[PDB]
Structure 1
């Protein structure tokens, strides 16, 4: 069909905003994957960060998958975009890679924050709750 039988109280701005959130956290998982195998190189070799940034890459991958499950569950439609490459491959120092990993988080959290505000203005208790419990 072309009309969702389950879609109810799921706004046009909510459906698009989590699709905009699908690709942001898929991008984040690719940013952390790039950093993980930077601290895995012989030129740096920081196994504590090479494994954390790999684990965080899996975490952002699961965050997107649960958001994709939220799209089909609410009746919305997943719209996938390209996953842009990170800003660099040679993250230079081991502190610059972390400088970018800090800036990236205060934009992902500053997208769930606006997402939750949107879920509040459009009166979506289910979407509000999903954000507060994930």
Structure 2
């Protein structure tokens, strides 16, 4: 056992390793979405910037969790990162809704991790999660809500002008 390990239950260790996988998965979904909007037949390059930047942020989330795992004396076990559920994301509003849906899954997973950490009386782990993940799930979910709503009210996905104007004025 690790000379640093203190108050770090192996269920919390197991859960952090599968949160690490979900954060890498999330980053890969976003990578897929970003380069979808790069396509010459979609061509929304602020949608592409937006999802690429969320792709990088979600990789920082993974490494933070991996750093946490070593800080606490657990051992990273990496898993396959599954390909995203869709090669084709259909529209800007559809990707935004898929992202909002992904972000709610990721957040549900973080709420479970926190419930477990709470059950395991790991206040450093709870604080770690509250400090670095919980509010930025709320913030990202709220921001995608904002985005989904404006896109709908602008007349997406049926309107091509809606996704264009949103791309320049909200995402530029």
Residues of 1 paired with 2:103 and 2:20: CA distance? 15
Residues of 2 paired with 1:86 and 1:69: CA distance? 25
User: Could you say what secondary structure the match of 1:38 adopts?
Assistant: helix
In structure 2, what is the equivalent of residue 99 of structure 1? 97
Match of 2:37 among 13, 36, 39: 39
In structure 2, what is the equivalent of residue 50 of structure 1? 48
State the 4+ residue runs in structure 1 displaced beyond 6 angstroms: none
Q: In the TM superposition, what is the alpha-carbon distance from 1:33 to its structure 2 partner?
A: 0.4
Give the conservation status (yes or no) of the 8 Å contact 2:30–2:51. Answer: yes
Q: In the TM superposition, what is the alpha-carbon distance from 1:93 to its structure 2 partner?
A: 2.1
In structure 2, what is the equivalent of residue 120 of structure 1? 118
Q: In the TM superposition, what is the alpha-carbon distance from 1:94 to its structure 2 partner?
A: 2.2
Q: In the TM superposition, what is the alpha-carbon distance from 1:42 to its structure 2 partner?
A: 1.0
Larger radius of gyration: 2
- The answer to which structure, 1 or 2, has the higher relative contact order (CA under 8 A, 6+ apart) is 1
In structure 2, runs of 5+ residues without a counterpart are: 132-172
Post-superposition Cα deviations, 1:60-114, rounded to whole Å, max 9, x if no partner, equal 0000000000001100010100000011212122222222111100010101111
- TM-score where L is the length of structure 1: 0.94
Give the conservation status (yes or no) of the 8 Å contact 2:23–2:61. Answer: yes
In structure 1, runs of 5+ residues without a counterpart are: none
Matched residue count: 131
